[PDB]
Amino acid sequence: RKQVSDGVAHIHASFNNTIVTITDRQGNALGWATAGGSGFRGSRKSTPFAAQVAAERCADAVKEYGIKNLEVMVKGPGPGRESTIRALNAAGFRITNITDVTPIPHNGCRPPKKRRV
Amino acid sequence: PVIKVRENEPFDVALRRFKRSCEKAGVLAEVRRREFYEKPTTERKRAKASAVKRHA
Amino acid sequence: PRRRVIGQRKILPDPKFGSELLAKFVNILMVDGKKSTAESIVYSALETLAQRSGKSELEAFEVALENVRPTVEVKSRRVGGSTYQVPVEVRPVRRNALAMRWIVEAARKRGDKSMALRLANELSDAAENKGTAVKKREDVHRMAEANKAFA
RNA sequence: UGAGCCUUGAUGUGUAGGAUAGGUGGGAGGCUUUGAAGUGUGGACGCCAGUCUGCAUGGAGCCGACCUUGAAAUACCACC
RNA sequence: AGGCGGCCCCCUGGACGAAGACUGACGCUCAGGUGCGAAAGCGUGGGGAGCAAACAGGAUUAGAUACCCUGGUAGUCCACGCCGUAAACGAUGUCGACUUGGAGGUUGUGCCCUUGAGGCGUGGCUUCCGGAGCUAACGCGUUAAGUCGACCGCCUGGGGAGUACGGCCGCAAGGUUAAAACUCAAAUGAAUUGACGGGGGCCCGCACAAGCGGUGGAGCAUGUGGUUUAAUUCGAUGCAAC
RNA sequence: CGCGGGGUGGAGCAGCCUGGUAGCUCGUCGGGCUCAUAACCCGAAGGUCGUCGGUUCAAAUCCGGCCCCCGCAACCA
Ligand SMILES: [Mg+2]
Ligand SMILES: [Mg+2]
Ligand SMILES: [Mg+2]
Ligand SMILES: [Mg+2]
Ligand SMILES: [Mg+2]
Ligand SMILES: [Mg+2]
Ligand SMILES: [Mg+2]
Ligand SMILES: [Mg+2]
Ligand SMILES: [Mg+2]
Ligand SMILES: [Mg+2]
Ligand SMILES: [Mg+2]
């Protein structure tokens, strides 16, 4: 049902949690998986291996939709920056676009203050 | 850094290229800079320090 | 040592078969220095396993060890306040030793009437993967697996 | 895009086991040119065993108590 | 000066320079006086995304009115005003003059055939190292803290106290000017040897790790302490007394 | 009293939803681990599955009475 040949794969690589989300060419989701939603908390949450695992899980989930070719959207810097992509490659999706959509502000919005440790 | 995969090219190589592109951009560094707000004074001080370091 | 990396002392093989591993096992078993008793116990254990399995005394020893030895072992790093118990690749030299130690511990724990008999039983359990040492190995592996995340 | 229903097609692994046996009554043969074995398979389900077909190819056979089972043929079936 | 960074237009200040032309001391500083003056704040009116005092909850914590997280009002933004303080700091008043230098950078400009980005030199502007010199040294150092001149401003031990009281200014917050009594023998400044750092780098020890056995729990030996005794000889007291 | 849903390890919730089937959140102890309370895993004790009978090979799972908790509207001399 509602099968697709190729779709976008958003990886939200952050300092806290890596998010893997597989969506349509235009922007309609099918299945997502998170490193925190794989059975990992705190120190295990922000991890390349965990990210990889999450990616694998996502791939497993989306295999019902008949996806063959793949494109990946990269958002933010995290521990799972390339590990995630490696995972999906291993899972067997013929990667075409390694898109980077990192949210760099052009000096507008005020950031929060420094963490004094 | 929007990166496309060429024909007759491995995945690892593509990944490496992407990494290089990222490095060239300095996106991660920018994010780090913007992670927490910097007071202008502090930034200026840092710049001065960097300049000092440059002189060897 | 902070400075010294030295080649370890030569340990002579077992009198009955010709095995360094067996000797090492005996040493591990032995405390206070009573080697001849320990050796005898080991021999007895081997005999019972042979009587049970109907196989070679050393080969059986080996596969039991194989069944109880892990590939990955956790190690504390202590960088922050929270535990950073990083898993590390274990060398084939000390892995064996660790397995032997585990076996010994299991034997100690066991409540059969002869110590030789106890360890024979442990060996048997290892062969059929159901004993205490094997269980310990399993969770060690699980612990490593959980935190294999770190490098 | 939900609600039923006259209706017509799917659906039923306790382990014994030919393997995805719901039961209760009529039967030892029903089906076939309102086209039988075997072959490429689309889509499904799925216990991954296999289970229901759509369409093409092929043109004269698959099944039945079987050995099993607390229950027997999906050899024909109605009440559902 | 405070400051000011998307872009584009309008209005406009100033600087700097090059050839030249002209005025002819028109110069300098500045008590009082006037204007400008980050931030926060204050005032009406707006505007309000984020951020974020206060504030709330969570943690953390011995406690946690904090640091940390989630949130979140004033404020941060404009409009015309007030405020008039900042470590407004080059901690160096302002101007003018002179004295071996370099590496540069920045911003121009004029000749020589630019015979090529370039070359000759040669003027303005800013940064670092540093000679003479100077200083308490640190250091500053043709942008002086050097050698002189002018002119001001301000200091005269610390604290009390840049506070009181009074004035003047302020819507208010307060600002400004500015004491005294009493009190202390120091108060500092630079640098030096040290030590120390929950600074940095190096190395090392059974220091950790990895391991092997303990003690600590029991009884016994012993020694101390504590209590007790007529007397419990006295000393030993982190390691380095038991 | 009429009707509807529930009695599930120490507690609550899935398994009923059309027989072939004890899982979830903790709680408790032990082990590993940390300076650790904790976080985290491994292992275990802990349930006439309201009660009882019936159909059946097979029920906590279908039904019947009975008991308890709740919800429901209802009148209440
Ligand atoms: Mg004249
Ligand atoms: Mg302001
Ligand atoms: Mg205001
Ligand atoms: Mg905050
Ligand atoms: Mg609080
Ligand atoms: Mg002042
Ligand atoms: Mg300033
Ligand atoms: Mg001053
Ligand atoms: Mg200098
Ligand atoms: Mg005052
Ligand atoms: Mg003791």
UniProtKB/Swiss-Prot annotation, chain A:
It holds the Pfam family Ribosomal_S11. PROSITE patterns: RIBOSOMAL_S11. One of its GO terms (cellular component) is cytosol. GO terms for biological process: cytoplasmic translation; translation. It comes from the Bacteria. Gene3D superfamilies: Ribosomal protein S11 (3.30.420.80). InterPro entries: Ribosomal_uS11, Ribosomal_uS11_bac-type, Ribosomal_uS11_CS, Ribosomal_uS11_sf. Keywords: Methylation, Ribonucleoprotein, Ribosomal protein, RNA-binding, rRNA-binding. Part of the 30S ribosomal subunit. Interacts with proteins uS7 and bS18. Cross-links to IF-3. In stalled ribosomes contacts ribosome rescue factor SmrB. Belongs to the universal ribosomal protein uS11 family. Has been predicted to contact the N-terminal domain of IF-3 based on footprint studies; exactly how IF-3 interacts with the 30S subunit is controversial. This is Small ribosomal subunit protein uS11. It comes from Escherichia coli (strain K12). The gene is rpsK.
From Swiss-Prot, chain B:
One of its GO terms (molecular function) is structural constituent of ribosome. The keyword Aminoacyl-tRNA synthetase does not apply. GO terms for cellular component: cytoplasm; cytosol; cytosolic small ribosomal subunit. The keyword ATP-binding does not apply. Keywords: Ribonucleoprotein, Ribosomal protein, RNA-binding, rRNA-binding. Residues 45-56 have a biased composition (Basic residues). GO terms for biological process: cytoplasmic translation; ribosomal small subunit assembly. Part of the 30S ribosomal subunit. In stalled ribosomes contacts ribosome rescue factor SmrB. Probbly involved in recognition of ribosome rescue factor SmrB in stalled/collided disomes; fusion of protein fragments to its N-terminus decreases ribosome rescue in the presence of SmrB. Belongs to the bacterial ribosomal protein bS21 family. This is Small ribosomal subunit protein bS21. The gene is rpsU.
Curated annotation (Swiss-Prot), chain C:
Coiled coil: none annotated. One of its GO terms (biological process) is ribosomal small subunit assembly. Keywords: Ribonucleoprotein, Ribosomal protein, RNA-binding, rRNA-binding, tRNA-binding. GO terms for cellular component: cytoplasm; cytosol; cytosolic small ribosomal subunit; membrane; ribosome. GO terms for molecular function: mRNA binding; rRNA binding; structural constituent of ribosome; tRNA binding. The strain K12 sequence is shown. Part of the 30S ribosomal subunit. Contacts proteins S9 and S11. Cross-links to IF3 and the P and E site tRNAs. Belongs to the universal ribosomal protein uS7 family. One of the primary rRNA binding proteins, it binds directly to 16S rRNA where it nucleates assembly of the head domain of the 30S subunit. Is located at the subunit interface close to the decoding center, where it has been shown to contact mRNA. Has been shown to contact tRNA in both the P and E sites; it probably blocks exit of the E site tRNA. Protein S7 is also a translational repressor protein; it regulates the expression of the str operon members to different degrees by binding to its mRNA. This is Small ribosomal subunit protein uS7. It comes from Escherichia coli (strain K12). The chain holds residues 2 to 152 of 179 of the full protein.
